Paper text:
During bacterial translation initiation, the 30S ribosomal subunit, initiation factors, and initiator tRNA define the reading frame of the [name]. The first step during bacterial translation initiation is the formation of a 30S pre-initiation complex (30S-PIC), which comprises the 30S ribosomal subunit, [name], initiator tRNA and all three initiation factors. Upon correct decoding of the start codon by the initiator tRNA, the 30S head shifts from an open to a closed conformation, and the 30S-PIC transitions to a 30S initiation complex (30S-IC). The structures reveal that all three antibiotics bind within the E-site of the 30S and preclude 30S initiation complex formation.
To determine structures of 30S initiation complexes formed in the presence of Ksg, we incubated purified 30S subunits, [name], IF2, [name], fMet-tRNAfMet and MF-[name] (Met-Phe-[name]) with Ksg and analysed the resulting Ksg-30S complexes using single particle cryo-EM. In silico sorting revealed one major population (359,652 particles, 76%) comprising 30S subunits with [name], [name] and [name], as well as a second minor population (61,790 particles, 13%) with the additional presence of initiator tRNA. In the Ksg-30S structure without initiator tRNA, the body of the 30S subunit is well-defined, with highly-resolved density for [name] and [name]. By contrast, the head of the 30S subunit is highly mobile, as evident from the poor quality of the density and low local resolution of the head. Therefore, we performed focused refinement on the 30S-body, which further improved the resolution (2.4 Å) and density quality for the 30S-body, [name] and [name]. Ksg was bound at the tip of helix 23 (h23) of the [name], adjacent to h28 and h44, as observed previously on vacant 30S or 70S ribosomes. We do not observe any additional binding sites for Ksg, suggesting that the secondary binding site observed previously may be specific for T. thermophilus. Indeed, we observe density for the Shine-Dalgarno (SD)-antiSD helix that forms between the [name] and the 3’ end of the [name], as well as additional density for the [name] extending into A-, P- and E-sites, which is lost at higher resolution, presumably due to its flexibility. Based on this comparison, it appears that the +1 and +3 positions (the A and G of the AUG start codon, respectively) would be stacked on A790 and C1400, respectively, whereas the -1 and -3 positions (E-site codon) appear to stack on G926 and G693, respectively. Interestingly, the kasugamine tail of Ksg can form stacking interactions with the base in the -2 position of the E-site codon of the [name].
Numbering used by the authors:
A (entry chain F): 2 to 101
B (entry chain J): 76 to 177
C (entry chain O): 2 to 89
D (entry chain K): 13 to 119, 130 to 139
E (entry chain R): 21 to 72
F (entry chain U): 2 to 66
The structure:
RNA sequence: GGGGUAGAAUUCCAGGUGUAGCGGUGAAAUGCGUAGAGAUCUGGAGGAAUACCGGUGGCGAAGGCGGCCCCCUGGACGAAGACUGACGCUCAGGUGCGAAAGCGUGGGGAGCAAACAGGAUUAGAUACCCUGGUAGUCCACGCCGUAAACGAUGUCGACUUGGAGGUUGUGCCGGCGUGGCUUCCGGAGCUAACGCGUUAAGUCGACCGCCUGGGGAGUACGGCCGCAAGGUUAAAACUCAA
RNA sequence: GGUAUG
């Protein structure tokens, strides 16, 4: 329904990111879901500390999808303790253009 | 250093303050009772009780009507207070009976 | 609210056209669908008082449309209340 | 002692008092001095001047640590905000950083009732 | 107005991080509200500071 | 407010900066109004009064010109 | 409506540093602190509330509603059409919603705080002020049904000069229109006056509610409702000449 | 700091 999943990763487990991406984006396409964007910004400085950490690894997934898969992605992000913080927004349309 | 507890041990016995209740010659019964309940409360806490009776104008010319009131209070507070002073005369326009706890 | 598809189904089924959105049958049908759907909502969300006021306006608006049709044309009325499964 | 050299001057400037604690950069306390400890009593504590004196007595309690640079962390609405800082400069310590660190509660907790005075 | 467009958002916050009034920046009311939501999403992702 | 003292600038100048920094951020004004509870009716009352006064300026700073 | 989540702050807990005060007031004292407080730093626990944005801004029938995110969901407005064909307006009784306090059962409990305890002030001070502090404030479910629940202004429709704004659509070429909501001023008119004034308190029409001197009294009695607190309906004698 | 009472 045009989501926009950002998620930040514990910068140690930046190793795990390209694998974790696939595992999620596979479950999207598993139920008909587009991936209109995927922009790994990579390691960045947090503007404030989050559970000790002063940097973290950001990823941006603009995703058309059903609702059930987005719910499953939230449970994954919750338990996957490498993921420090996630935000699933909604968007009106799909966004393919590049973001800073 | 340990003056803190010495100061407390001093203060844990209270200084007797003097509470003032003021009557008039024509103080009515219910209002008298309120003032008496005040005095009872004061004396049971161990405070002295400067009971005053203020005359006004020509009420001066009927001193004994005032004196009656002070006598009444003494009698009512008999098994509780002791008269440290009773007024002989009207000093100014007042008559000050100091009571004190037994 | 009903989806554009769910609407356009009901309009086709009860209309005399796909232009025929105005018909009392369509209007009552549309209202009956959305009324029925919301029975789910208010079983879960029993304290959603503000939403329930919207529901009662649908119930009320339906009752009025049915009473209009009952006196305008009783044949159309009897069919409609069986098709939609309405008591009165 | 360990010649701290660079330390931190936390000025708790309340409406009634002015605490002045000098700490190291890790926020371990070296020496402290309140306006209420500086002779002033009652609402003479709550003066700019009593803050000035409190700073000076704190300065002279961290003589042994031989501090030279200070970070000033003022906290609160008190009269002894600027007065404390001016004193620390004149006391010889060079001021690298002055920061307001007054708490604002981003809403939080219900304050006490207004005084009907 | 984009929560990710930190360069644009930085024009509408103060040094301390607080959102600037539209009376100051002369922004239109519709955009001030979009801008406010943007700034608040940024802050959650730690792309802008809440404070300091 | 993070007035770090710059190179070759006097203390008194840096303290004026710290004041203007705090006076604009409005830290002391904030602490004052959070000292005691103001119930919402009182908050709204003051907000309306401020608005009427601000309005009464605009129809008297002009309305005269 | 539901669920999640974030940062700030307060309290507490555990440490580190540190040492004699802190706190409070008009002034004090109660209190806290050498069993090491307050201050400062680190970490943890927990509850409640969302700074700035924020606006005579917005939304809602009213009560009311303010971090962010999702889920479920109601209403409003505009643009062109297309469709139904008076299907409308109002509404006694009825039904529901309804701030806060309060009540029941069970959770929770940071902060705040009726009661209460103490310290003061005082002629007294059952207060205001200070230190504390329980119910409560929060959650769930159930009750209660009242507020200056106010625009002190019932709902719907039509008509009747203007000015300055705000907010939210939209058409056309920053300008020129055209809708919705809204703040302020003012014309005619209205009004006892104050004022209201196209969002009317103007000019009219439909329907409903309500008033008939003050006090007695929103009380008594009765009924209905309520676990209770009470609520609702609602008099009279009498007395006054306002 | 409470301006009890001509
Ligand atoms: C300050 C006092 O103010 C009020 O009493 C006033 C009285 O003290 C005299 O000044 C005059 O008779 C005034 O006309 C009265 O209004 C009255 N509210 C009681 C107050 N006093 C106290 N609370 C107190 O003394 O204590
Ligand atoms: K997580
Ligand atoms: K009817
Ligand atoms: K409590
Ligand atoms: K007149
Ligand atoms: K009468
Ligand atoms: K009754
Ligand atoms: Mg509205
Ligand atoms: Mg909506
Ligand atoms: Mg309540
Ligand atoms: Mg309860
Ligand atoms: Mg308290
Ligand atoms: Mg209190
Ligand atoms: Mg009423
Ligand atoms: Mg109002
Ligand atoms: Mg009324
Ligand atoms: Mg109606
Ligand atoms: Mg007007
Ligand atoms: Mg009238
Ligand atoms: Mg009654």
């Amino acid at each position: 329904r045009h989501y926009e999943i950002v998620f930040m990763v514990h910068p140690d487990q930046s190793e795990q990111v390209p694998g974790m991406i696939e595992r999620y984006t596979a479950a999207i396409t598993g139920a008909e879901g587009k991936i209109h964007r995927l922009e790994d910004w990579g390691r960045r400085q947090l503007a404030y500390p989050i559970n000790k950490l002063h940097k973290a690894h950001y990823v941006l997934m603009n995703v058309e999808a059903p609702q059930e898969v987005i719910d499953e992605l939230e449970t994954t992000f919750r338990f996957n303790d490498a993921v420090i913080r996630s935000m699933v927004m909604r968007t009106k349309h799909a966004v393919t253009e590049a973001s800073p | 250093e340990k003056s803190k507890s010495s100061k407390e041990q001093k203060k844990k016995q209270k200084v007797i303050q003097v509470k003032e209740i003021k009557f008039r010659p024509g103080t009515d019964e219910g209002d008298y009772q309120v003032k008496l309940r005040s005095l009872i409360r004061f004396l049971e806490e161990g405070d002295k009780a400067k009971i005053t009776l203020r005359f006004r104008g020509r009420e001066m010319a009927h001193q004994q009507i005032g004196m009656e009131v002070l006598n009444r209070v003494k009698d009512d507070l008999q098994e509780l207070a002791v008269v440290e002073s009773f007024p002989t005369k009207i000093e100014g326009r007042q008559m000050i009976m100091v009571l004190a706890p037994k | 609210s009903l989806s554009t598809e769910a609407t356009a189904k009901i309009v086709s089924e009860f209309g005399r056209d796909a232009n025929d959105t105005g018909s009392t049958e369509v209007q009552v049908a549309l209202l009956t669908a959305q009324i029925n759907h919301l029975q789910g909502h208010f079983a879960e969300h029993k304290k959603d008082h503000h939403s329930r006021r919207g529901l009662l306006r649908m119930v009320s608006q339906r009752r009025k449309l049915l009473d209009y049709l009952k006196r305008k044309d009783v044949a159309r009325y009897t069919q409609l209340i069986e098709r939609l499964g309405l008591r009165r | 002692r360990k010649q701290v050299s660079d330390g931190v001057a936390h000025i708790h400037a309340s409406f009634n008092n002015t605490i002045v604690t000098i700490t190291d950069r890790q926020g371990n306390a070296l020496g402290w001095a309140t306006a209420g400890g500086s002779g002033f009593r009652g609402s003479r504590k709550s003066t700019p001047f009593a803050a000035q004196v409190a700073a000076e007595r704190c300065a002279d309690a961290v003589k042994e640590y031989g501090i030279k640079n200070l970070e000033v962390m003022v906290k609160g609405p008190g009269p002894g905000r600027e007065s404390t800082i001016r004193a620390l400069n004149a006391a010889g310590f060079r001021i690298t950083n002055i920061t307001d660190v007054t708490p604002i509660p981003h809403x939080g907790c219900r304050p006490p009732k207004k005084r009907r005075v | 107005i984009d929560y990710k467009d930190i360069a644009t958002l930085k024009n509408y916050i103060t040094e301390s991080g607080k959102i600037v009034p539209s009376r100051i920046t002369g922004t239109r009311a519709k955009y001030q509200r979009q801008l406010a939501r943007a700034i608040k999403r940024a802050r959650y992702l730690s792309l802008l500071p809440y404070t300091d | 407010p993070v007035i770090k003292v710059r190179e070759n600038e006097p203390f008194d100048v840096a303290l004026r900066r710290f004041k203007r920094s705090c006076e604009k951020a409005g830290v002391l004004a904030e602490v004052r109004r959070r000292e005691f509870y103001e119930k919402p009716t009182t908050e709204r009352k003051r907000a309306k009064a401020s608005a009427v006064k601000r309005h009464a300026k605009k129809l008297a700073r002009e309305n005269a010109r």
